[PDB]
Amino acid sequence: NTNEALFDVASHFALEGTVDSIEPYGDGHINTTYLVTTDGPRYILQRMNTGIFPDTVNLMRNVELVTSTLKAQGKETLDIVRTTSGDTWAEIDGGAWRVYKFIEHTMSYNLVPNPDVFREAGRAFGDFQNFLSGFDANQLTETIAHFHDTPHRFEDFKKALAADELGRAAGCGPEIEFYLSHADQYAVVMDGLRDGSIPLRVTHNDTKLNNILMDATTGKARAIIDLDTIMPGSMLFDFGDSIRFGASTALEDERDLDKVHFSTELFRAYTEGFVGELRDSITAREAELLPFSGNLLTMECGMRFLADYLEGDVYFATKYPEHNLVRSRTQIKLVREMEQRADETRAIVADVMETT
């Protein structure tokens, strides 16, 4: 979208000041996000990715339900700015757009800078599980099917591999072999959900560190800021995915793999914060799987990155041809380290469960 086009889009919303600029904000993989600067307040303007989220009406119904409930509890959350026609979003020139108020005086992190920040992230997402337990499974629509159904993701991967539409398979044999050889590990959470041994809960489903805003002065969690995948799942998806992104010593797309390690110190910090909020609620079987949920969600996301690479990068935004291969490689290195530290992560969870 050109500058003129974006100003036109913003004109559809009930903003409370004259727009001075609209500039790309962040490096999200999915939606297209802009910071709108006025002569007074600031706003986040987003074009929703309708290739990924085709059901905008149900997506926005979820977002409206979650934010209105948080507000009714006095909690800070994403504040939808309505269109001038009074709607929660608008279709404008072939795009689906929404506006949130910009949440001021915050810090957000694409990588853990210190254990305290990750411990606070643990508190925030653990607290968010208690919030989501207030909803029935049926109140929140699945916005994406099979979202953390790792065996289903693996079927998708094999289809991408078989098509090999760009002939990229030949250059990622070792990565393909990793996901093939780990196929026996993908079913554990889905099987437990299906047999009732793992409770079905409403979960956030994209608990990466940069989805919590911390207060710029105190560092206390202020608000969670991606509500697009709130829907039934397992607590293990939220824990495991937090560990995948945040217990890494490197960026998700770190090109130098010698920078990429799984840190048990960071794993412990997050576990302390998360289990601290949930200790009397977590089931024995959930606790048992906390360390492996890290391996599982990391393998699932890596497999998705590699599938996308093999499909010509149709899902995730990329900046260069091998971007998704580079992303997949970090996830592989992390899993390999998580495997080597399995006894230690088990002992960490036991100690936190005992301590809390």
Binding site residue list: 29, 206, 208, 252, 301, 304, 315
Which lies closer to ligand NDG via its Cβ, residue 123 or residue 208? 208
Tokens, residue 235: 């607590």
Which lies closer to ligand NDG via its Cβ, residue 123 or residue 244? 244
Cα-atom radius of gyration of the chain, to the nearest Å? 20
Closest CB 354 distance from ligand NDG, rounded Å = 31
Amino acid 186 reads: Y
Q: Which residue is nearest to ligand NDG, using beta carbons?
A: 29
* DSSP H stretches of helix in the chain: 3-11, 56-72, 115-132, 150-163, 173-181, 188-195, 235-246, 264-278, 284-310, 323-340, 342-355
> Within 13 Å, how many C-alpha atoms sit on residue 63's CB side?
24
Binding site for ligand NDG (CB under 6 A): 29-30, 206, 208, 228-229, 252, 301
Which lies closer to ligand NDG via its Cβ, residue 293 or residue 348? 293
Which residue, chain included where needed, has tokens 């990622």? Answer: 172
Q: Find out whether 297 and 313 touch, Cβ atoms under 8 Å.
A: no
What is the distance between the alpha carbons of residues 344 and 201, in angstroms, rounded to a whole number?
Answer: 28
What residues are designated binding site for N-acetyl-alpha-D-glucosamine?
29, 206, 208, 252, 301, 304, 315
Contact residues for 202 (Cβ-Cβ < 8 A; gap 6+): 132, 133, 135, 136, 137, 139, 140, 230, 231, 232, 233
Which lies closer to ligand NDG via its Cβ, residue 253 or residue 277? 253
Closest CB 252 distance from ligand NDG, rounded Å = 5
Which lies closer to ligand NDG via its Cβ, residue 67 or residue 229? 229
Closest CB 243 distance from ligand NDG, rounded Å = 12
